[model samples]
Target: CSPIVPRNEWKALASECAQHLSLPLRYVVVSHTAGSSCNTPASCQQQARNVQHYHMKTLGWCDVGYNFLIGEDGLVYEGRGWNFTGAHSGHLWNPMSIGISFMGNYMDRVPTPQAIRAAQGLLACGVAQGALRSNYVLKGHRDVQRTLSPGNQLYHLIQNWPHYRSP
Candidate 1:
């Protein structure tokens, strides 16, 4: 399993439901927080809490939307995890994918090498644990939505990943 920071570790507030994910996820949707970036473990944990608060309280989601959140400090923060559906990728693809959001905007910023490797490792762990399909495709948020998510730099980088499929 990946070295994921559990909800308790991040001090996540209570989620409304115990939602479940569809098994053997076929896609891994990549997105960016488009907010502040944190590099320290302490700050990253706080960032996770802030995101969950927005997703739950402001956006009215049952919980934080991404299945996992990757921090610049090279840590994976659990959101819905492998057992729950996420609200990050919109209706067309959310049910069949695992949403993994990089912890900061990638419009013009490229993530640290640590962050990139952590994401790749997380995906591998997901497949190993049967949470994701071995041949799962990778999609950027912009590929399925009308927004410029994952940003240009990050989107460009992901396009060359082994599982990437242009949409």
Candidate 2:
């Protein structure tokens, strides 16, 4: 299914994608492993839904914590909507970015080609749609913080993403 977040709901949720780039976002960071299909080890789609539930109920967010979650199925699940600030990318850079997390561990392992392709596809879509800045800085979770987020191995895959149109 295409990543459609309900049209009726879209009007209610403010999306300032076209607004001030510096005001809304300056970067689009990609994370390797997420609380999504990652760390859950259950059915991939089920875990994604579970993560969404936790973000809504426990985290008290409008939706999932990240702005978007890229699934192995090659679909980008919308989280927290467009205008809502993400709880990801940590405190230092959350305001100026939209964080995207994949559904698996990439440190000790590599993501499925489909998964990486999907992420890359979605990022390209974001750029074409004007949802992301033309020169939005791409980074891993480890780049902003000292944690081993997105795994060391997966980090390498997207480490030089700045050179490409999509990561």
Candidate 3:
């Protein structure tokens, strides 16, 4: 299993979640930051902060939207963590799902192998930790929302994943 980088490790700002999420979530929603990619730990750390700033300060969300973020550095950065409902889906589906986002635009380019593996491993760990169901479904952000999130290339990639569910 891949090690998840705790929120504190990324120097994440304190968050005030509007609601708490239940354990063994049934879904995992995927998205992309639609920003630049970070290939190293130092750059990935800063990238996490940048996303948090936009989600918290700019968008006035309770926290960075996703439950976790995957970086090109092959790291999983905690966003809202496991206890809170994320702002990822604007409350419509946040309570039932753990949103996982890739930390870069993937409309054209696919994430690196390490980044992909880290995300898949994180899912397994979630199940082991009792945070996600063993048979939990996975969906692209666009599957639940009217946005081109998780992007074209990434969406295609995730479609081949075993957990992915049809729209």
Which model scores highest in lDDT? 3
1-167 in candidate 2: lDDT tens per residue?
23533323222233323222233356777775445453222355565666666666676665566777766665555665456677777776777777788876677776777677767766766666766777667878887866787887778888766533332
RMSD of candidate 2 to the truth, in angstroms, is 5.5
For model 3, how does the per-residue alpha-carbon lDDT over 1-167 read when each residue is reduced to its tens digit?
56888888999999877688988799999999888899999999999999999999999888898899999999999898888899886567999999999999999989999999999998988888899999999999999988888999999999999789798
lDDT by candidate, in order shown: 0.90, 0.63, 0.91
Off by over 4 Å in 3: none
Task: Please list the Cα RMSD from the true structure of every candidate, rounded to 1 decimal place.
Answer: 1.0, 5.5, 1.1
lDDT of 1 at 161: 94
Candidate 2, residue 28: the lDDT equals 77
List TM-scores for all candidates, in order: 0.96, 0.74, 0.96
Which is the better candidate, 2 or 3, if ranked by TM-score? 3
Worst 10 residues of 2 by lDDT: 7-16
The digit string of per-residue lDDT tens for model 1 on 92-161 reads: 6878899999988999979999999999999999889998889999999999877898999999999999
TM-score attained by model 2: 0.74
